[PDB]
Amino acid sequence: SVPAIFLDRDGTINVDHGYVHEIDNFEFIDGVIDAMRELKKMGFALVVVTNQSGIARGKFTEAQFETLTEWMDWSLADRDVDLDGIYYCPHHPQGSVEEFRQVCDCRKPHPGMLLSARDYLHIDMAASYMVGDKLEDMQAAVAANVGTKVLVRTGKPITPEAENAADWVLNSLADLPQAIKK
Template identity: 65%
Template sequence: MAKVAIFLDRDGVINQDTGYVSQVDDFHFIDGAIEALQLLKKKGYCLVVVTNQSGIARGYFTEDQFMQLTEWMDWSLADREVDLDGIYYCPHHPEASVEAYRQQCDCRKPAPGMLLDAAKHLKLDMAASYLVGDKLSDIQAAMAAGVGHPTLVKSGQSLDESALGRAEAVYEDLLAFAKAIPALGD
């Protein structure tokens, strides 16, 4: 049986988007984000992080540094009874300064590659799933991947009319979203 997921952008949804976050000291969970993730798990959802990380392609930090931070985030959440079901990231950028990452890919949002990979690996019901992002490219990726509920939060980027017009719903932050959606089976 297919599972229902909450796809989560990282910067601006889970943690404060201070620009190319790559160090533990710079990673700050948004107020209420951990509580939101705990609630979403209790409601029966798979939690899948999908994050563009062009800082790797731009040479601001290495893929190893990103992986170390991701491992720290994952353990920090696990210590608070939040087990992520998947973490997918795109290190590419078409104008990368690091040649190995300079490419047009199918994983960099707004392309749907990360979401489609997760759907395949985790056997997800995309039409019943949600994506929570903070910008237009998140919504575009959700729509291209067939995610039924593309959602925005105001805790990250400032939202423009094109993003607002395409989202199914807009919430103040991840906690407001988590409180509003039904538990699976309700």
């Protein structure tokens, strides 16, 4: 078993412009890649858990997501950040795409993506961390039994509720490794 950092994507790793599904619009947040490289060095498995409802909406296709995801994966690996896992939820209850229109267990606040990652990589949850910019990220982490829940200021201004749920509030994923050391 290994400890892990569960990573929310939009607003945590990349700037949230809304329904980002293009390489052209994918901008990595400052210091996040270096921090991810460092987090890995420290010994954490790195797992991305992202809700991608735009797929259900028909904003962008599933294949489009994969193309961005592969690129993201390559860009990181090239920087010596090798991601342990990447999980996503394409569903929404009101989705206009029939294939993806449903209630599901993988859509945060639901803890399914995290549980799925845990069984696959044999992660030790109490030792783990969750970093996100939204309350659902915190809620999924609590459900999943993650030890420390971290909120970040890289999204839209954080709600009091998300803040209530969080264990830590940090400026960026960039500041996580230092935070863990102290």
